[PDB]
Amino acid sequence: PRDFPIQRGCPFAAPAEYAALRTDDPVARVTLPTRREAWVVTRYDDVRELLSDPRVSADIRRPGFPGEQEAGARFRPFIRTDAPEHTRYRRMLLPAFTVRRVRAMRPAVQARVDEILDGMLAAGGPVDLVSAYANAVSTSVICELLGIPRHDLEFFRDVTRISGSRNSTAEQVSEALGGLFGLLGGLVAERREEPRDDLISKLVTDHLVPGNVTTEQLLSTLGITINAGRETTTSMIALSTLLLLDRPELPAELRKDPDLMPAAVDELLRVLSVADSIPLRVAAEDIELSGRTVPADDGVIALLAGANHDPEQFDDPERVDFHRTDNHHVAFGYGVHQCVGQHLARLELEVALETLLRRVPTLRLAGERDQVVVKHDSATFGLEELMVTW
């Protein structure tokens, strides 16, 4: 008779009903919208170790929910394989990802956010954020990641808009795809020749051209790569914003001394924890966890939020306090699955929020609390429309 909660309490996030299911059914049973039964974990350490158990992988029956489906045995998406197929992709790509690398694009991520703003304020209007800033950056961040060039960014921003979201036609969606990959291969072939030092560059030269880089396979992952970031951060940005945006104290601290958003972005990431439902893992075996053991071959997701607001982790978890000692959160992943992406997802996230309140201080909502609208369509969380001016 059981369900998994939207909730989201709204305001801000996210625990919903979980307070009860955190203290008590620490592993309670709950139906998925597909009415397949499965298991759900809500206590910080439960959520984490559970996550990096030896025996927990992704694959065939019976995980997640998307109507549909344990089908397909869609190949790849390697973000739902266990090892040794999944690892050889994950690692195929880490060396690129890293930090020494990620803090490097510090000037180009800055650059880009700045140039996108240049227009924000130039076409003026009381405009929607999510669509306008929020997405804009996100994509373009990832452009800067994959070496995507000059301003064939709308060559790009477009097959994103189309391909990804709401309504097609299937053919004319499938047509979007056509470009994205005309684009990619464009590049995939181009960096074989004059290889720059970006993500196609990394994947092509080191791995591709001499390894099990099979140009079937690249585009695949480059696919799975863009799909990491467009929706998930855009999410974390425009929500993070709306938080700040309606609770002035928060900008406050962040202005007295702007050496914060780092701590802030970690803190928001935790507290917003929009990444909630990680995959879901089928339990490889029976597994002890606060003793209630999870049956061999069952569905078990790990609620990132539930865990992110567990007091066993850190005191007073609702409070968006920025000067916490202790916030080894995991709005990102835990264990060999964890968000490879997140080093970006931080520069994405600070340069984005940072500047919003540098260059455009107190913009405000065009809309009203009572017509702001939160997306809920993917499990990764976000907002449909956010409406502002300055």
Give the footprint of ligand HEM on this chain (CB under 6 A).
79, 90, 142, 225, 228-229, 232-233, 236, 274-275, 278-279, 304, 331-333, 337-342, 344-345
Least distance (Å) between residue 171 CB and ligand HEM: 27
Using CB positions, name the residue nearest to ligand HEM. Answer: 341
Q: How far is the CB of 275 from ligand HEM (least distance, A)?
A: 3
Judged by beta carbon, residue 298 or residue 348, the one nearer ligand HEM is: 348
Residue 90 annotated as part of some ligand binding site: yes
Compute how many other C-beta atoms are within 10 angstroms of the C-beta atom of residue 383.
21
Q: Which residue number, 184 or 331, has a Cβ lying nearer to ligand HEM?
A: 331
Q: CB of 130: closest distance to ligand HEM in angstroms?
A: 14
| Nearer of residues 172 and 212 to ligand HEM, judged by Cβ | 212
In whole angstroms, how close is the CB of 356 to ligand HEM at the nearest point? Answer: 16
Cβ 210 to ligand HEM, closest distance in Å? 22
Residue 180 beta carbon to ligand HEM: minimum distance, rounded to whole angstroms: 14
Nearer to ligand HEM (CB atom), residue 120 or residue 331: 331
Q: Is 207 annotated as a binding residue?
A: no
Measured from the CB of residue 94, what is the shortest distance to ligand HEM in angstroms?
A: 9
Is there a binding annotation on residue 339? yes
- Of 132 and 303, which has the nearer Cβ to ligand HEM? 303
Cα separation, 278 vs 332, in Å, equals: 9
The CA–CA distances, whole Å, from 80 to 32, 72, 89 equal 18, 12, 11
CA 18 to chain centroid, in Å, comes to: 22
Nearer to ligand HEM, 284 or 366 (CB): 284
Structural tokens at position 336: 């060999």
Q: Is 281 annotated as a binding residue?
A: yes
Question: Phi and psi for 27 in degrees, rounded to 5?
Answer: -125, 95
Closest CA to 45 of 319, 328, 318: 328
Tell me: is residue 86 an annotated ligand-binding position. yes
Question: Which residue, 55 or 364, has its beta carbon nearer to ligand HEM?
Answer: 55
Q: How far is the CB of 371 from ligand HEM (least distance, A)?
A: 26
Residue closer to ligand HEM by CB (options 140, 387) is: 140
**Nearest C-alpha neighbor of 356 from the set 123, 106, 132:** 132
Q: Cα dist. 264→68, 275, 358 in Å?
A: 37, 17, 15
Please give the annotated binding residues for heme b, written as ranges: 86, 90, 281, 337, 339
Please give the annotated binding residues, written as ranges: 86, 90, 281, 337, 339
